[model samples]
Target: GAMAQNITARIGEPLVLKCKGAPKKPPQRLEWKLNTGRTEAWKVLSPQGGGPWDSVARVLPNGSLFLPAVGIQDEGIFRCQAMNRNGKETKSNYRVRVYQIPGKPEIVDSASELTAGVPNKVGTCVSEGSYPAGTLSWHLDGKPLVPNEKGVSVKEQTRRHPETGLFTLQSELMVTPARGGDPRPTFSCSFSPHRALRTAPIQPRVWE
Candidate 1:
């Protein structure tokens, strides 16, 4: 087996993959196949006739593969075979990975007030409609809040959308607010895929 070129595609985006091993001129024979670790390898495209997945993707005249709208099901190992003028077979492989960016994390079920020494549920941060799921972390006054330390604890949960196969992430933060011990700790949660962060406030009503 030849080493495959890793390719990443965002869901619902257009993706073009060139068959670099194919000759510049039209090859004697050209075909593309997809291996999804299923029962049998799916013939994607061929010179004679288009394959079963033609509705979603196609092969261009120059032997490049084009996907109109990539989907999660498109994730697989794509093999391109071209017969050069010399009658020798040339091949290339691409491992396609699909990804989807989730919505911005939002704070829900926010606490109205923190009662001094008791651990209170500050808020739950959620990131939804994403592929491969996403990570969530808590921040206090722009600093990372380590769980089980400094009166902080975190609980997390994840779920997958039954139809779309997308993921939803939920993380709840609990903190013990102290009176006159520190300034109001601005709480926030950050989601991965870079910078999808949200913040919520809990007024301190320390009744000591």
Candidate 2:
């Protein structure tokens, strides 16, 4: 038995599982199965010369499995069994994992104003409905914020959806404003893989 091939798929995308070592020509007995968890039940996906399979999944003529749209439930172990020309049997296995990205991050609980030379809680950046979670980052006026640099800090948290199995990510940004030419210090937040979205600018007031 050979090691199972590892594959990572994105939600709502197409996937292909190759049946390596299987004969390309006819006179083959190629069968694909899905390994149902702990029960160890192998559900036959496509049998040799069998009736039509469901539209979502099917076995190609070349002994490869095709999935038109990989759904969340499609994550699992799959096996492709075939016999070689010498009448020796060969099997290929695959483990599929699925992932999803959350939408644009939004700013909430923003401060009305910022005082110069003091650390202020700007706001919270939030992104929800993602699988496998995601990272959050803070930016200042189009510049990526470096945590602990000149009084810049970011706090992050993640909440999992028990029903949908998704993630809700949040990051709170704090910054110390300075009395300088850049009086209006704008802030932004980003969920990895997507650019930061702008939050309302806070006008920093200087003390005498």
* Cα lDDT, all candidates: 0.77, 0.74
- What are the models' TM-scores? 0.83, 0.69
C-alpha lDDT (0 to 100) for residue 3 of candidate 2:
84
Range of the 10 consecutive residues with the lowest summed lDDT in candidate 2: 199-208
Query: Which residue ranges in model 1 land beyond 4 Å of their true spot?
Result: 24-28, 37-39, 42-44, 86-89, 178-180, 193-208
lDDT tens digits, residue span 1-208, model 1 = 5698999899889998887667775544777887763316675666454456667777777788888988887888888888776778888889998889887778888776677788888888889988878788888777788898878889999999988889999999998877665545577788876346564544434444
Task: Please report how far candidate 1 places residue 142 from its true position, in Å.
Answer: 1.7
At residue 96, candidate 1 shows an lDDT of: 90
Over 4 Å off, model 2:
1-6, 21-27, 31-61, 67-81, 84-95, 193-208
What pairs collide in candidate 2? none
Q: Residue 163 deviation, candidate 1, in Å?
A: 1.8
Poorest lDDT segment (10 consecutive residues) of candidate 1? 199-208
Candidate 2: global Cα-lDDT?
A: 0.74
Q: On a 0 to 100 scale, what is the lDDT of residue 179 in model 2?
A: 61
